[PDB]
Scaffold this active site. Sequence first.
Site, PDB file in Angstrom:
ATOM      1  N   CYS A 145      -5.045  79.946  35.118  1.00  0.00           N
ATOM      2  CA  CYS A 145      -5.721  79.152  36.139  1.00  0.00           C
ATOM      3  C   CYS A 145      -7.114  79.690  36.443  1.00  0.00           C
ATOM      4  O   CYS A 145      -8.022  78.914  36.759  1.00  0.00           O
ATOM      5  CB  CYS A 145      -4.881  79.112  37.415  1.00  0.00           C
ATOM      6  SG  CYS A 145      -3.581  77.856  37.419  1.00  0.00           S
ATOM      7  N   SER A 573      32.218  59.677  18.234  1.00  0.00           N
ATOM      8  CA  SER A 573      33.524  60.110  18.719  1.00  0.00           C
ATOM      9  C   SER A 573      33.529  61.592  19.063  1.00  0.00           C
ATOM     10  O   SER A 573      34.098  61.997  20.082  1.00  0.00           O
ATOM     11  CB  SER A 573      34.595  59.807  17.673  1.00  0.00           C
ATOM     12  OG  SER A 573      34.464  60.666  16.554  1.00  0.00           O
ATOM     13  N   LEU A 578      38.244  60.541  23.300  1.00  0.00           N
ATOM     14  CA  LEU A 578      38.313  59.154  23.748  1.00  0.00           C
ATOM     15  C   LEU A 578      39.376  58.382  22.976  1.00  0.00           C
ATOM     16  O   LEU A 578      40.145  57.609  23.561  1.00  0.00           O
ATOM     17  CB  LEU A 578      36.945  58.490  23.584  1.00  0.00           C
ATOM     18  CG  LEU A 578      36.554  57.371  24.552  1.00  0.00           C
ATOM     19  CD1 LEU A 578      36.703  57.819  25.995  1.00  0.00           C
ATOM     20  CD2 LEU A 578      35.134  56.904  24.279  1.00  0.00           C
ATOM     21  N   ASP A 617      24.408  59.063   9.521  1.00  0.00           N
ATOM     22  CA  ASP A 617      23.796  58.497  10.715  1.00  0.00           C
ATOM     23  C   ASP A 617      24.172  57.026  10.843  1.00  0.00           C
ATOM     24  O   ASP A 617      24.247  56.300   9.849  1.00  0.00           O
ATOM     25  CB  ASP A 617      22.274  58.656  10.657  1.00  0.00           C
ATOM     26  CG  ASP A 617      21.580  58.133  11.903  1.00  0.00           C
ATOM     27  OD1 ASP A 617      21.568  56.904  12.117  1.00  0.00           O
ATOM     28  OD2 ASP A 617      21.032  58.953  12.668  1.00  0.00           O
ATOM     29  N   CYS A 653      21.604  61.818  25.065  1.00  0.00           N
ATOM     30  CA  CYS A 653      20.383  61.414  25.752  1.00  0.00           C
ATOM     31  C   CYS A 653      19.341  62.526  25.708  1.00  0.00           C
ATOM     32  O   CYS A 653      18.664  62.811  26.697  1.00  0.00           O
ATOM     33  CB  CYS A 653      20.685  61.010  27.193  1.00  0.00           C
ATOM     34  SG  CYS A 653      21.484  62.301  28.175  1.00  0.00           S
ATOM     35  N   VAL A1007      35.117  63.446  25.985  1.00  0.00           N
ATOM     36  CA  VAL A1007      35.570  62.917  27.277  1.00  0.00           C
ATOM     37  C   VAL A1007      37.000  63.374  27.527  1.00  0.00           C
ATOM     38  O   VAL A1007      37.811  63.386  26.584  1.00  0.00           O
ATOM     39  CB  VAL A1007      35.470  61.390  27.283  1.00  0.00           C
ATOM     40  CG1 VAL A1007      36.408  60.780  28.313  1.00  0.00           C
ATOM     41  CG2 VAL A1007      34.046  60.959  27.547  1.00  0.00           C
TER      42      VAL A1007
END
Lengths: 1027, 524
Positions: A145, A573, A578, A617, A653, A1007
């Site tokens: 700075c 998966s 799940l 993919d 995400c 999950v």
Amino acid sequence: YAPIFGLMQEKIYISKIVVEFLQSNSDSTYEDLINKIETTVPPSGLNLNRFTEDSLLRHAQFVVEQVESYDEAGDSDEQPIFLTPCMRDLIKLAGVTLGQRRAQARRQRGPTKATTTKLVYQIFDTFFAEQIEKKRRRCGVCEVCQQPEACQERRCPNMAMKEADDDEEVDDNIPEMPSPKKMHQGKKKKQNKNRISWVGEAVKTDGKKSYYKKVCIDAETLEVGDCVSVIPDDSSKPLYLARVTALWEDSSNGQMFHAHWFCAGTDTVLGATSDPLELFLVDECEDMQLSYIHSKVKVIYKAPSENWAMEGGMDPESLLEGDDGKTYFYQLWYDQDYARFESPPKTQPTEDNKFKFCVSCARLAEMRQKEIPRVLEQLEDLDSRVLYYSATKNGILYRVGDGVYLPPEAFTFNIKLSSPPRKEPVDEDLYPEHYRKYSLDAPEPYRIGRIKEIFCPKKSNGRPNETDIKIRVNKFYRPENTHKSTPASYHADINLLYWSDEEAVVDFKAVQGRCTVEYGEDLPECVQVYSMGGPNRFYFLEAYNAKSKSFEDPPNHARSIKLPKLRTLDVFSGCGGLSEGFHQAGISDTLWAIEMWDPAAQAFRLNNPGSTVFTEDCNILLKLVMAGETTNSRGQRLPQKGDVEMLCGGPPCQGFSGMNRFNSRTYSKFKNSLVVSFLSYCDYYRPRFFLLENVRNFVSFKRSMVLKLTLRCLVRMGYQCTFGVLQAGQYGVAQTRRRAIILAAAPGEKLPLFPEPLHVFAPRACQLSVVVDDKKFVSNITRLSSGPFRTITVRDTMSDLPEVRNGASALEISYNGEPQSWFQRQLRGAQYQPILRDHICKDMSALVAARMRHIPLAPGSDWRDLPNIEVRLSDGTMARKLRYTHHDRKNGRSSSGALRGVCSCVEAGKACDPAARQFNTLIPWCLPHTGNRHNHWAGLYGRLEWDGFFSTTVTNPEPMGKQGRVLHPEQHRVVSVRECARSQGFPDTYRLFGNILDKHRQVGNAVPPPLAKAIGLEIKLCMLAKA
Amino acid sequence: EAHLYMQVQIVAEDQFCGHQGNDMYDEEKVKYTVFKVLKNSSLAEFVQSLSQTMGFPQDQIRLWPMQARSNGTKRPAMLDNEADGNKTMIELSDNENPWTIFLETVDPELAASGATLPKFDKDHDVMLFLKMYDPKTRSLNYCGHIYTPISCKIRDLLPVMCDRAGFIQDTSLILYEEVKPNLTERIQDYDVSLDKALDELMDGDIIVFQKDDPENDNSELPTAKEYFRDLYHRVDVIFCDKTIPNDPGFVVTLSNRMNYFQVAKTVAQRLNTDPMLLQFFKSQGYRDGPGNPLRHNYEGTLRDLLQFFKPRQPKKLYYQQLKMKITDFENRRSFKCIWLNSQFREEEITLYPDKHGCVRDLLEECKKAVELGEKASGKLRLLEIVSYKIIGVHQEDELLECLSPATSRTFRIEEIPLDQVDIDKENEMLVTVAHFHKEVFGTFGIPFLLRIHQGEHFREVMKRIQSLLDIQEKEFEKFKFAIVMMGRHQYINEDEYEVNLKDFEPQPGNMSHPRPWLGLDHFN
């Protein structure tokens, strides 16, 4: 000078390791960094054993300066390499100051593209127009700075870190923002029209002031069912639109009509994302004079095509015909309260109600009749009270002899129930860190009873009072509530109840639901089948008496389709938790699944023999099925259109992990992420049911933008949607991890509800509300901080596991013990001679091993109870005591007057003193170094309580990581792979693959199948309803 | 033409006497009369054949087909000899075979006196069965059956019941109905007709009665309800010792409603041992063999232990007798250590002390486990060794839970040698000795403590070393002797006899840091 040269070589080597690892990826966590450091093979030339966490903690300053020097030379729009979460946590632990020296080198693959379909591409490009429209000042104390030329070389790393924390923190989790009010509730402007005239005679003569007409003239022909625009009082709101559902003349008032409102897409959750020409039905209608009518507008009910299952992949321009987008149109009923999108209600007007029917009026009438608690059948009469045989409430019918829930405050037991120390101040020499310790709780589950009679009190006139209904209940003592207290519930079945003879009286409004309570001997089958048969089934064996505190036999007067499994595609998966939950629900057979990670694919193959798993993919296979191929490069038969029936999954995400508003670069990444590919899959294949799952923050990602855009794309697709968040621990798991769920149903189907909570939980992790554009959205859950089953505690999750020590790697071990907890009984199975598998915990460093060996066994104990004693280690090295060389003002000195500070930074505005640090110390140096700035790091190096629960998901347990406590309550070890899987609820027979790290990751990511089953039951409730 | 016949099993009333169980009789302890009969034969022909074969007039017998009810009971039902007499038995049974029928006849000793078979009105009469419960003997006495109008009042049957059971008349009686196993319902009102008193009244229902007498409260089952309850939960378990191969075991009758303590006490009684000296094992249950071990604190019941057996299979339970109390046996710690014998040779041993014990207890187990010296001390001690170096001696009061859990930690137990207890303090010094090949880092072998005198004839010290080692002789020659201090080493000339304490003690007043030690070089 050999040790110093060796240390310099180690610093250079660790800098190279960290910089190359950061080149490899920019999403790794602190635990992955730890793993990369320890797994790295030391060089042959330099004489050292192996890199440990102490090495990184002591070379932090050099490694961080090298990392920032790498990114300070070439600056681009890409995120700088030192804001990776792992590196940021390392800064947060060790007090390293950023931006010094650097530039010591002495002059020393593609954006990709998701295979989105035309319509999904069209939606994304459509909203792209609006993403271009466009406190925490620089610290001024760092060297960067202070440097002269904002400027690329004047970027403050401290403010970058603070901005990253702001992007990570939720802004803001206020309770309210009250629930949204009714729309169009404001007054509307009166329109000055020339002439208003009826055409023809009164269609229906009701005999009252109302006489129903057909055609009205306001300089234009208007008939019932036409759509009318209205200009209300100017309150910064656009023109209203409503359909004239009834036109009639009143003998008392002027010219009257009933208007059923529409709702614009902007007014819903969709907001700006919605098409301006699009509208939705809503349950808001009102009476109004036609004097406020502005003009006639035409709308069209865009019904889905009869070949809707085959419409995926076609060009929208081919189907854009015709006259679109030119006029308004609606396709989905909308409920703003629960953010629900349904197909329009198919209620059919009766013949006498052709020309006055309003779907909103009918829905409101049926709803208000439903909520009213109404008694049904009279049975017997007395001078004071009148008896009834059955009653109903909220669409549920109760009869004399049905198990009934009751709120925890409904009644009290005859047992005395709860019948109500301090240690001396420990030595500050032996325990120099105890002072930092210091200086809501999960409610009891639903009371459950059995009705003895339903009755109402006679009024003064003698007529029965139907405003209230009083219910007499025989109470069912749970094992907890009996005189043996909570330890009586460690072993007993979760259902198990005890009959009693005490009678209570409650108001009918207090009743919250029906549960079937039944005997255990008159059962036609074994009690296990009855318990697993369906929800809210409780079984009582023997009665409990409180006066003698004894157990007797219950008195005699206390005794009393299959749809085909859907073909399923599971996107991302992982280990298949799940899929296992869905199979437990018995509604789904997974026939195909996608997963890039090899160990997850192998685990799915082992757990699901009759399924196809593709290790590529998803974009490649999607493009392949667009191009029309039938076998992949490996010859596996890819499913075609119509084969898949249920499409479920959850994408990562990582590329858009922030929360701040969208940016051009962030969206350029997001458009070719995995969620868009998932939406394209759903578009092309047209499943019957569609399940999307992700972390809680996914709801508020980029200011709820991802959720809004996904909902817009789905609505354009023609589906029916809803969304919410669920607390996994409420469904039979000893873990706190909120998960955001998006549910979608194909046209003509029934939209599934969200499963009601089963296990009571801590309200501090029960915040299921959602904020979107300053609006509060709550899912359809009706149970708040209550439920039938007690909590699932860590003791009822790991108790009877055989004792193993640190570094245990015996894949196959004997159980050496029968199951002791209900959860364990349900996890093991009905056959009892297995070999328990994967009961392996990490083999950590000897120094850390001793550290966690000395932690006391008192509940909640952590690093703050660590003794400062010189202790021998496994490798033979020496662990020196911690020396206090400074004094801190904020905390003061010890009772013995000893120094409490550890570094020069305790004094305000004082730089950290180099060479004042300590390492290879039994008590860490960084924790006392930076306790004050992070709430003493309370909980770190702590032990899981025998009554608590896992802090969060456990992907790679580590004592000083951010995943909370990772220590076994009694044994000196971290929670093992089997223990981690037991947390999520995996059945013991479930199989895994890979090494210990991979097994831990696969357990963490998936999950919880108890959650998946909880969803799986609800979807099946909709499959049954249609047929 | 065997497929056109069926076995019709006739049961007489004599089989009803003595039955101690539910309903009328035990299916296993019954004698049938089996008839191989043509499916198309009429009922009348079979009634004629029976009356003629067994020697009674056809109008002196009544046929009561044995029929199963919804509740799981099996009771006599009505058959009309006249109306239904011409229908085939195969259509009447609704595809049943063998078909058991109760044959009701008149007592030949009461029939020789002229009495005949009473008439029975199907609509208004009923057949009641009467049992007598004796609390003192805890037993059932079959008291025959009776024809009675449905509308008749119980009070008019009380004198009959009394004198039919051998009771003095006008004796107060407690009456129950046996609805099914585990359901015995007391009859509260004696003034109501049979129709009202018995819900869903059918032929073959059983009413049990007993005296109303304070003495009944001295019996452990004062009433038939608790008797039928205890009978409902009784089960015979076959206990087998897992050590004895193919041990057939012994059978004990217990109640399902039993916890661990009662089962253990019972088995200990039938085995003449202390309950704490028994460990039990649940069965595998698909296979026959010992399964998961059971902890002493198990809070479950007997049904849980037997739940995966079928009701037909013999219910087995494994066990073994213990030499120590079950709590200490469940709190035993697998302790692997090394035993040093009189010959200075290492043995691998595994001991199981109680987890909450001290070093003294470990040494005591090891003493019970091993042999001591010829006439040595007879006192043992516990060394802790890591990396072939002695890192400590453990005092016999130390807690077992504080012992170094690391795999590198080896616990040794050894007798103190005679030549180290009392030495000459200003002359003799104990030095630590170890092996190493080539350089001094790669150490190996069994280190030991060696006495050293003052100005002493070094070949005496090497013959002492040889007395310890005692290998073939002429590999001793390749030993290179060195004095090691802080990593430096100076080799010592063997024939120069250079010895004095100064080359073995650290600097003045020095303990904390490594003391000089003797180093031996050779190849292993």
